[PDB]
Amino acid sequence: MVSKGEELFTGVVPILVELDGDVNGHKFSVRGEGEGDATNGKLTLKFICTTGKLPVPWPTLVTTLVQCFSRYPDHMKRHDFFKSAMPEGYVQERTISFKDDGTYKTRAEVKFEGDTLVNRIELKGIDFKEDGNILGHKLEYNFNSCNVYITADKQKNGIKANFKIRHNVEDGSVQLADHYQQNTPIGDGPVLLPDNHYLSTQSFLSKDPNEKRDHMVLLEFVTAAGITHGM
Amino acid sequence: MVSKGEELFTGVVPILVELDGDVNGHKFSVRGEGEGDATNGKLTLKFICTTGKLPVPWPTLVTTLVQCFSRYPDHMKRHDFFKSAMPEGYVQERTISFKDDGTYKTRAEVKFEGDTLVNRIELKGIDFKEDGNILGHKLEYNFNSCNVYITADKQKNGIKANFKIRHNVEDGSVQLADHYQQNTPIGDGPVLLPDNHYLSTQSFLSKDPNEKRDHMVLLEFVTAAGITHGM
């Protein structure tokens, strides 16, 4: 039984991402466009800094810049909160604590505006070191993680996640980014509260050789796993 | 340019797996049947121990029981050795060293026999402890890993991999299984030697409630990543 939220994702869906950021008083905007193919768990986006030089490394923004495009295998569809909240969508909040450096706090609404899945984000960054790995642009241009665990919000409709991102630093050290995440449905419609499970994400960060603006080309594959009940 | 080996995988392909095993002199056979969908990197197999009780835990056999069904994204197809060797196929050899316990040595041929992709394996296990985690059946019925790195065989046509599998033990400890892998093409036809990359595998192990024989139902999703050149 393909749920109504699920039905919105059965084809290729256009994506718009808008981020307005302030890190230590550096104002920037990022705009991304592309498409999501939830059936294959495939994301293809190109992000532009529309205000000039991005004052943080692109890799620090990957997690902030649409978990509704996760490939949930058939036997796990009952645990897909992200599509069940659509089209009205969900609020996604994070604290991202960079070890020995500053903090990002993000608030986003992920929802349909007509035929497009929109992720509209506000980001505030404080306590960054002027010559640390983030404001100093010392992070390698890549992105790796090994499973983000998703859990039901146990006081209310929604999900939570906490996970650690390891950013390679150019000197061969590692910059830790501890993520705390809470998602709440925007509407009052029924949603699916999941059992514990995880999302596995592979990421490819490249450049468009003809693009002069500061930018990130991003390809992702995402698959849910960690529940075997009901197959 | 869809290579001829690639073309053999564009649909759903039937799979046959045959394993003849000897662990500490316990003779067993495993037979598996199902299908591979390389376009989605999806494997669905059911394995039977045709000789009675499997004398090792099913999870210890998952890696031995067809990397040609990996989803290689478009920009990485030139690095897919496993399909390039088809239909004549490849020899896949492993040593699997169980920490504080015995060793498996495996030799398999992965090739097409008519319309079916066949994995035919010989397994020899020695130096197992009669009451260790393997012959004692103390391993949880599940399977997790975080990336297997694939490299070109640098003296000859083929690939190598070494990776560590962590099997959960029922007391809450961990049984390490260190895998060393070498694959060689069976034919003399051109093959693709890859740049360094990895395979990401999600695994679901269940039971058929109507199956009385010792068995494992296995669903897998596999995606290649770790190269961004040429997108």
Author numbering:
A (entry chain A), B (entry chain A): 0 to 64, 68 to 233
Please share text taken word for word from the publication where this structure appeared.
Here, we have linked one of the most common protein–protein interaction events, homodimerisation, to an essential trace metal, copper, through engineering green fluorescent protein. Structures of the monomeric and dimeric GFP-diS2 suggest that charge switching is through peptide bond flipping and the formation of a buried organised water network around the chromophore that spans the interface region.
The introduction of the V206F mutation plays an important role in promoting the dimer formation as it makes interactions with 6 residues in the neighbouring monomer, including a pi–cation interaction with H77. The water molecule close to the CRO (W1) observed in mGFP-diS2 is still present in the dimer but 4 additional water molecules are now observed. W4 and W5 are above the plane of the CRO and occupy the space available due to rearrangement of the C148–N149 peptide bond; they form a H-bond network with S147. Crucially, these water molecules are also largely buried at the dimer interface thus restricting their exchange with bulk solvent.
